[PDB]
Amino acid sequence: DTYLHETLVFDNKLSYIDNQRDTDGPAILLLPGWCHDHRVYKYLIQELDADFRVIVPNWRGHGLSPSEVPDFGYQEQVKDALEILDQLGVETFLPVSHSHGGWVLVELLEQAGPERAPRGIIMDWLMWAPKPDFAKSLTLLKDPERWREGTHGLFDVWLDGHDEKRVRHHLLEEMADYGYDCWGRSGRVIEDAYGRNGSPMQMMANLTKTRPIRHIFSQPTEPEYEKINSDFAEQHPWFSYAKLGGPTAFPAIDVPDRAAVHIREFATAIRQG
Ligand SMILES: Cc1cc(=O)c2ccccc2[nH]1
Ligand SMILES: [K+]
Ligand SMILES: [K+]
């Protein structure tokens, strides 16, 4: 992209997006999920580019040139993200995550505190403990014989029977160059994160300093899913959700306008005390 930079972060060389917009805070920090890069945010960046400083960190072995790296998890993602934020001299940021980027967002909210990271937005992140089908997929991702088969079953779930041109391009073209190294790592970390933390909702409830977090999602579409978000929202003043009605698990791609108004609303709220 026009905005794609690269820096040394401890051992590893990481690419990141930085639009270097010279404007009022907070910074908008878009956090990739596993085994994809800033390319998932190219439509979202367009919505935000003019009115905000937009930062997109790419994880170790993630970017236009995927490469094998030493095993790491979401704690390393936080430190990696914070190291890029120190080098860019960014203080106050609004983290916005996609899917299992959420583990990075919540740990980041903890480690940075409510002053630097006063709110967060989590997009299409499975709020409940893995269901058998998702549990099955992590299995396949972790198996060096069937990891690719694992990715294809997930692609089926994320597209939800839609011929959605932009999302299909993301999955089959922009994730094509990611291998078992990444997809195997993704299965290991996400499985461990649900195992260790219970769920995203347990992790968020467990924060030392609870904060405005909004879950914005299109999937899953079933009533039972909306109710756990609704019940959690009832129990926690700080939690809200928005069902975006988009066709796929990638609203950043297929309803970027809708993603942006929620991001903008949280950005506005931050700018006003
Ligand atoms: C980009 C992306 C989205 C996901 O929901 C996911 C889940 C498991 C493994 C890898 C993954 N990768
Ligand atoms: K279509
Ligand atoms: K609430």
Partners of residue 57 on adjacent β-strands? 16
- Closest atom of ligand 1 to 187 CA is 9
- Residues recorded for the chain: 273
- 189 is a domain residue: no
Tally of domains within the chain: 1
Q: Give the CATH number, domain containing residue 228.
A: 3.40.50.1820
Q: Give the determination technique.
A: X-ray
Instruction: Please report, for residues 123, 217, 234, the alpha-carbon distance to residue 222 in angstroms, rounded to integers and kept in the order given.
Output: 17, 12, 19
Please list, in sequence order, all residues whose beta carbon lies within 8 angstroms of the beta carbon of residue 215, skipping any fewer than 6 positions away.
Answer: 122, 123, 125, 127, 229, 239, 240, 241, 242
- 184 is a domain residue: no
Q: Does residue 186 line the site of ligand 1, with CB under 6 A?
A: yes
- In degrees, rounded to 5, the angle at the alpha carbon of residue 251 between the alpha carbons of residues 247 and 256 is 120
Ligand nearest to the CA of 139: 1
Q: Which domain holds residue 37?
A: 4-128+199-271
- Alpha-carbon distance of 203 to 193, in angstroms, equals 9
The alpha carbon torsion through 223, 229, 232, 237 (nearest 10 deg) reads -130
- Alpha-carbon distance of 167 to 236, in angstroms, equals 33
Instruction: Please report, for residues 20, 22, 105, 271, the alpha-carbon distance to residue 50 in angstroms, rounded to integers and kept in the order given.
Output: 10, 10, 24, 16
- 134 is a domain residue: no
- Closest atom of ligand 1 to 158 CA is 5
DSSP SS3 for 6:
strand
Data resolution in angstroms: 2.0
Please list, in sequence order, all residues whose beta carbon lies within 8 angstroms of the beta carbon of residue 260, skipping any fewer than 6 positions away.
Answer: 44, 47, 48
- 120 is a domain residue: yes
All residues with CB under 5 Å from ion ligand 3:
233, 239
Q: What's the token pair of residue 253?
A: 């791609």
Q: Does residue 248 line the site of ligand 1, with CB under 6 A?
A: no
Q: What's the token pair of residue 68?
A: 């094998």
Q: Name the residue at shortest CA distance from atom 12 of ligand 1.
A: 34
Instruction: Please report, for residues 6, 246, 268, the alpha-carbon distance to residue 26 in angstroms, rounded to integers and kept in the order given.
Output: 22, 27, 9
- Closest atom of ligand 1 to 126 CA is 5
- 192 is a domain residue: no
- Alpha-carbon distance of 81 to 55, in angstroms, equals 10
With CA atoms as reference, report the closest residue to 157 among 247, 45, 43: 247
- 185 is a domain residue: no
- 137 is a domain residue: no
- 170 is a domain residue: no
